[PDB]
């Protein structure tokens, strides 16, 4: 298990444009295209991302390509965010993956808003942090996923992803 397998499990793989949990056009492995309600706009963002006129369909390789770029960007975003970096640097590898997972799903801003939970992680109060993370819209709207990520922060193991 690693960040890519982890996020591949949580985001799936779809080769045609689809709407994510929030109703937003996305494709591949959770690659958000736009928050616009316009499919055409999404198609535009897609072609731009791929570098060709796709007609809302991409190949597996292309999806993996955006996914790799997306994971990298997420980590890189973590490293440039003063709110996230210290916490990230304080964590072990497994837990770091959990934080990358959240940032990929909701943006570094979204993540930086978990100030208090983040502080608990830095203090290494695992149980406490986990309780706190659950008090969020994130957990209420995507509870299974959230539970997995929270389990990962609580234990520092991949138990929630093993056998999935
Ligand atoms: Cl892109
Ligand atoms: Cl979920
Ligand atoms: K998805």
UniProtKB/Swiss-Prot annotation:
Subcellular location: Host cytoplasm
GO cellular component, one term: host cell cytoplasm
Positions that bind substrate: 32, 104, 117, 132
Gene Ontology MF annotations: lysozyme activity
Keyword Hydrolase carried by entry: yes
UniProt function note: Endolysin with lysozyme activity that degrades host peptidoglycans and participates with the holin and spanin proteins in the sequential events which lead to the programmed host cell lysis releasing the mature viral particles. Once the holin has permeabilized the host cell membrane, the endolysin can reach the periplasm and break down the peptidoglycan layer.
First-level EC class: hydrolase
Name of the gene this protein is made from: E
Expression triggers: Expressed late in the viral replication.
UniProt-reported outcome of changing residue 11 to A/F/H/M/N: Complete loss of enzymatic activity
Similarity field: Belongs to the glycosyl hydrolase 24 family.
Protein origin, superkingdom: Viruses
Annotated active site: 11, 20
Effect noted on mutating residue 132 to I: 5-fold decrease in enzymatic activity
CDD domains documented for this protein: T4-like_lys
Record keywords: Antimicrobial, Bacteriolytic enzyme, Cytolysis, Glycosidase, Host cell lysis by virus, Host cytoplasm, Hydrolase, Viral release from host cell
Effect after changing residue 26 to H: Facilitates transglycosylation more effectively than hydrolysis; covalently bound substrate
EC number assigned by the record: 3.2.1.17
Effect of residue 11 to Q: Complete loss of activity
Protein name (database record): Endolysin
pH dependence of function: Optimum pH is 7.3.
Any GO BP annotation: defense response to bacterium
Phenotype when changing residue 117 to V: 50-fold decrease in enzymatic activity
């Amino acid at each position: 298990m690693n960040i890519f397998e982890m996020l591949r499990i949580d985001e799936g793989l779809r080769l045609k444009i689809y709407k994510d949990t929030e109703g937003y056009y996305t494709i591949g492995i959770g690659h958000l295209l736009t928050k616009s309600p316009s499919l055409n706009a999404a198609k535009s963002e897609l072609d731009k991302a791929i570098g060709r006129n796709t007609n809302g369909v991409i190949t597996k390789d292309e999806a993996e390509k955006l996914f790799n770029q997306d994971v990298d960007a997420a980590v890189r975003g973590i490293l440039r965010n003063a709110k996230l970096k210290p916490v990230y640097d304080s964590l072990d590898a497994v837990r770091r993956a959990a934080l990358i997972n959240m940032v990929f799903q909701m943006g570094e801003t979204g993540v930086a808003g978990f100030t208090n939970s983040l502080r608990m992680l830095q203090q290494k109060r695992w149980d406490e942090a986990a309780v706190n993370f659950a008090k969020s819209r994130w957990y209420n709207q995507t509870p299974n996923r959230a539970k997995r990520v929270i389990t990962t922060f609580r234990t520092g193991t991949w138990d929630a992803y093993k056998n999935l």
